[PDB]
Amino acid sequence: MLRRQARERREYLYRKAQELQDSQLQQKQVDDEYAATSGIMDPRIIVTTSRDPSTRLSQFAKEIKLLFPNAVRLNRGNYVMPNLVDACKKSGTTDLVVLHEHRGVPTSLTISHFPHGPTAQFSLHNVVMRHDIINAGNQSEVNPHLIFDNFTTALGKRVVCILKHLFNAGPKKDSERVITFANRGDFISVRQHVYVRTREGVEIAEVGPRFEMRLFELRLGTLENKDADVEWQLRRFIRTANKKDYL
Amino acid sequence: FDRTAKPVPVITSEVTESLEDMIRRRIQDSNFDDLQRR
C-alpha cells in the first residue's frame, strides 16, 4: 500500500511538470488535480485546528466549517499528521483545513487538497469573528454564490482554483448567500453578505466573519509532506517586497 | 527609516463603501464567478 503512494507521487510530479511545460509553450483550463472531479463530485472538507486549541480557534474552526457547505469540524486532540492525512485520505476527504492562533487570535490558515496536493498556507490578519457580534442570529447554509475580483496573474488563477472547489457547484440562481474573495495587493478581503433584490437596485448585509489572507507557501503535496516540491513561495526579504504585488 | 514589507491594511469606512459597491454591481449584473455542473 505504501507502494501505491510512492508511485503516484512520481506520476503527479510528472503531470505537473508536463502541464507546466505546456503552459509555458502556450505562453510563448482547470488544474490537473481538480480537473478529474471539478463539477462532478461535491467537495468533502475537514476543518481542524492545532493541538490544545484555545476556545476562539474552536469557534473560529466552527465558523470556517459554516462558511463551506460541505465542511465538518474535527478536534485535533493528540493526532499525528501522517495519521491525520491518512485518516482523512481514508474517509474520502477532498481538502483539509488547519487553523493556528496566538492567544486566541487566529494567525494562519492552511489548505491541503487530496489525494495528492497542492497545499496552500494563508496568514490571517484583521480577523473579526461573528462571535464578536451581539444578537447576530443563525446563518443561511444554502450553496452560496461566489465572487472572485482582481485575480489576473497565473498564480492568481491557481489561488482561484484552490479556493474555488471548496464549495458545492451549481447554486440556485436565486440562492441568497454570496461569498466574495477580493485581492487588493495580495490582500484577499473575504466577506459574507446576504442580499435582497429591490425594485431599483440591491442591498447587502454582512454576515461575517471578516478576515484577510496572504498566501505565503504553495507545495506539490499534502501538508504532512514537508519534503514536497515547492511550486511557489512568498519571499519577503527582497528590497521590492515593500511594493510588489502578485495576485 | 525604510520598512521592509507591505503594511497590513486598515479597513476604514471609505474602503468599506468601495468594497460593498462592487459587490452590489456584481449582483445587479448577476456577474457571478461560481462553479457550475459539468
Binding site: 473579526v128 457580534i133 | 486598515v10 479597513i11 476604514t12 469606512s13 468599506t16
Partner: peptide, 27 residues
C-alpha cells in the same frame, strides 16, 4: 445600510479601528 452592518445586531467594542485611523489622517 448602517443598521445591518454590525462590524461598522451590534459588535463588541474594539472590533474596529476606524477611530484610531481617522485621528491619524487628520494629523
Amino acid at each position: 445600510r448602517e443598521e445591518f452592518n454590525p462590524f461598522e445586531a451590534v459588535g463588541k467594542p474594539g472590533i474596529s479601528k476606524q477611530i484610531g485611523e481617522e485621528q491619524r489622517k487628520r494629523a
